[PDB]
């Protein structure tokens, strides 16, 4: 009986994460990511406990690409320790066989401005036609791609961006050329 | 007798490396580098067993500069972990006293495309007139210089570049202004 109870606890915990993913799932090609408790997680990134964070999956449509966002609070690569790194990730979708490849929809990475100025920091780019990040996925996720020097850490920590220890990240994927 | 046998084994091994260097030696100013077993050596670079690899010496002529190529499979500096780094090295030649200094011949770093497209990735540059890399050598080799962000790792691993776990690197040095 004890063994079954332990299995039930694991299954119940797994279902709880499943509810949240479906609750925040989006199918309009635009992802809004809310990261609460920024202070403690930024310290964890500095200490190396958690280098990067993964967003909930989002889709261009009901049967579109399965995508997500990856962020480095302390920076990654050349932006380690001085900037914030944001990366765009292509995940394996259940309908990848019916979707055109390589991925070519325009991807815009934006950092929402929580202040009254609404001066959102953004950086738009076109997917590389010959990168492993935008090919047809073979594993669970492909190689993350983005801007390691998206926003400077000092610039981010000059107010209007961290309210209630929470940051907002917006990813916009163009769907005007997708059936 | 045992001590002499150990010395003979060391000398025989040293000669074996000497044969290969002379076998692949070039004197036309163009170096073609073949790196077999790319999969295991890329893993070694990730594990830190061997960060960089050195090519066989090549020369602009029978009595020209003594030069070689240095590559980082996992990247170096700002391209560590995300790109492949290729560096160009000036070695001490036996006829350096008769050659003009500082080094100023145009150097082009190219990555051969083994596919039918033959879309070779290249990056040409002019030697810096006041860098320790292109001065008259004092030691065995000078400081390596090149492009740490030459080719992205994902771009490299999109086929047509690794056939039979082997990569080809081409270095072109202009000799039109050398006697």
């Amino acid at each position: 009986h004890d063994q079954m109870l332990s299995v039930h606890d694991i299954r119940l915990a797994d279902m709880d994460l499943r509810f949240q993913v479906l609750e925040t799932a989006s199918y309009n090609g635009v992802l809004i990511w809310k990261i609460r408790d920024y202070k403690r997680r930024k310290q964890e990134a500095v200490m190396g406990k958690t280098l990067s964070l993964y967003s909930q999956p989002f889709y261009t449509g009901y049967f579109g690409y399965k995508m997500c966002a990856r962020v480095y609070l302390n920076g990654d690569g050349m932006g380690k320790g001085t900037h914030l790194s944001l990366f765009f990730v292509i995940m394996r979708g259940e309908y990848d066989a019916l979707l055109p490849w390589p991925f070519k929809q325009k991807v815009t990475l934006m950092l929402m401005d929580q202040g009254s100025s609404r001066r959102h920091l953004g950086d738009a780019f076109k997917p590389d036609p010959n990168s492993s990040s935008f090919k047809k996925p073979t594993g669970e996720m492909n190689i993350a791609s983005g801007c390691p020097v998206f926003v400077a850490q000092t610039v981010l920590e000059n107010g209007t961006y961290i309210k209630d220890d929470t940051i907002f990240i917006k990813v916009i994927v163009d769907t005007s050329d997708l059936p | 007798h045992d001590q002499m046998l150990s010395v003979h084994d060391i000398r025989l091994a040293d000669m074996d490396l000497r044969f290969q260097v002379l076998e692949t030696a070039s004197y036309n100013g163009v170096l073609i580098w073949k790196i077999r077993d790319y999969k295991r050596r890329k893993q070694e670079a990730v594990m830190g067993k061997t960060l960089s690899l050195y090519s066989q010496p090549f020369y602009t002529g029978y009595f020209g500069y003594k030069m070689c190529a240095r590559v980082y499979l996992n990247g170096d500096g700002m391209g560590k972990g995300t790109h492949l780094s290729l560096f160009f090295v000036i070695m001490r030649g036996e006829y350096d006293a008769l050659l003009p200094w500082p080094f100023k011949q145009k150097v082009t770093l190219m990555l051969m495309d083994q596919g039918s497209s033959r879309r070779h990735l290249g990056d040409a540059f002019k030697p810096d007139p006041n860098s320790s890399s292109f001065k008259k050598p004092t030691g065995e080799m000078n400081i390596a210089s090149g492009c740490p962000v030459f080719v992205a790792q994902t771009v490299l691993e999109n086929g047509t570049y690794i056939k039979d776990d082997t990569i080809f690197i081409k270095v072109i040095v202009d000799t039109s202004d050398l006697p």
């Binding site: 990168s131 801007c147 | 790109h83």
Partner: peptide, 17 residues
């Protein structure tokens, strides 16, 4: 505008709430 690959090392935790 040129995409830059990542430097996947570890310590990845999905966060959404």
């Amino acid at each position: 505008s040129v995409p830059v690959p990542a430097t996947e090392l570890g310590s990845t935790e999905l966060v959404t709430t």
